[PDB]
């Protein structure tokens, strides 16, 4: 996958370090992020470090300009899409983790919160992917929609998250989708894509954590 348009936050350093787009391009490799024959391999130990405003570790990409500068866009400028193919290889005790998001920069709202978070949850031996969407930028909560179930560890699945230039939010897994016209307050918020592994668990042995390989990861604003 093309890493030209991403920078990466890892679960090491206190607070957590953000690897620049430049450093990422120079074939950066570590236990937390590796370019493999199967794509990009993410790994986040449950006891890894956290960003200054979060309580959970992550090895997650954040959208940027090729210059490494954070890229926040308003949907009206074009058709925005994030497309991925991945397989979950390991999960933490809580058995859930964020695998993708459309986050808000909070430039024109009281908070910087995600518009949508894709959550993978392994229940026993079958994993399901839920889309947690918040109706308005300042909302305190989100609504969960199960897009797909029956995805065991190792089984590849695809997902796509996007917002049309007219404001139509589209979220899907294996093609199973949910479409929603965005509330007008979203039209003037800076939005950005994220992909990787963001845990929602922070306790356990170093041997515990989340792991996944993305065989496909494309971002486009056409």
Solving technique for this entry?
Answer: X-ray
Euclidean distance between CA atoms 13 and 9, whole angstroms:
10
- SS3 category, 182: coil
Resolution of this deposited model, Å: 2.0
Bridge partners, residue 210, by sequence: 44
Q: Give the CATH number of the domain where residue 155 resides.
A: 2.60.120.200
> What residues pair up with 45 in beta bridges, in sequence order?
209
- Here the tokens at position 102 are 């459309």
Count the neighbouring beta carbons within 10 Å of the beta carbon of residue 142: 18
Decide if 88 contacts 153 (C-beta within 8 A). Answer: yes
3-state class (DSSP) for residue 24: helix
Phi-psi region of 220 (alpha: psi -120 to 50; beta: other; left: phi over 0): beta
Report the C-alpha gap between 83 and 74 in whole angstroms: 18
Domain count, the chain: 1
Residue 180 belongs to what domain range? 1-222
Task: Answer yes or no: are the C-beta atoms of 12 and 32 closer than 8 Å.
Answer: yes
Contact 117, 132 (CB under 8 A): yes
> What are residue 199's phi and psi, to 5 degrees?
-75, 165
């Amino acid at each position: 996958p093309d890493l030209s348009t991403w920078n990466l936050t890892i679960p090491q350093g206190r607070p957590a370090i953000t690897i620049s787009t430049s450093q990422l391009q120079r074939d950066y490799r570590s236990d937390y992020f590796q370019r493999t024959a199967d794509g990009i391999r993410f790994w986040v130990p449950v006891n890894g470090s956290h960003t200054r405003n979060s309580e959970f570790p992550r090895s997650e990409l954040r959208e940027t300009l090729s210059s490494g500068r954070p890229y926040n866009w308003r949907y009206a400028r074009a058709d925005n899409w994030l497309e991925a193919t991945l397989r979950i290889e390991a999960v933490p005790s809580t058995r859930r983790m964020i695998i993708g998001q459309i986050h808000s920069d909070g430039s024109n709202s009281g908070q910087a919160a995600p518009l949508v978070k894709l959550l993978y949850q392994l229940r026993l031996d079958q994993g399901r992917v839920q889309a947690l969407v918040r109706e308005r930028p300042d909302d305190g909560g989100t609504r969960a929609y199960t897009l797909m179930d029956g995805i065991p560890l190792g089984q590849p699945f695809s997902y796509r998250i996007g917002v049309s230039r007219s404001g139509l939010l589209s979220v899907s897994v294996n093609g199973s989708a949910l479409e929603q016209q965005l509330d007008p307050q979203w039209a003037y918020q800076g939005l950005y894509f994220k992909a990787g592994l963001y845990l929602q668990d922070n306790r356990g042995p170093s041997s515990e954590g989340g792991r996944a390989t993305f065989s496909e990861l494309r971002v486009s604003h056409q």
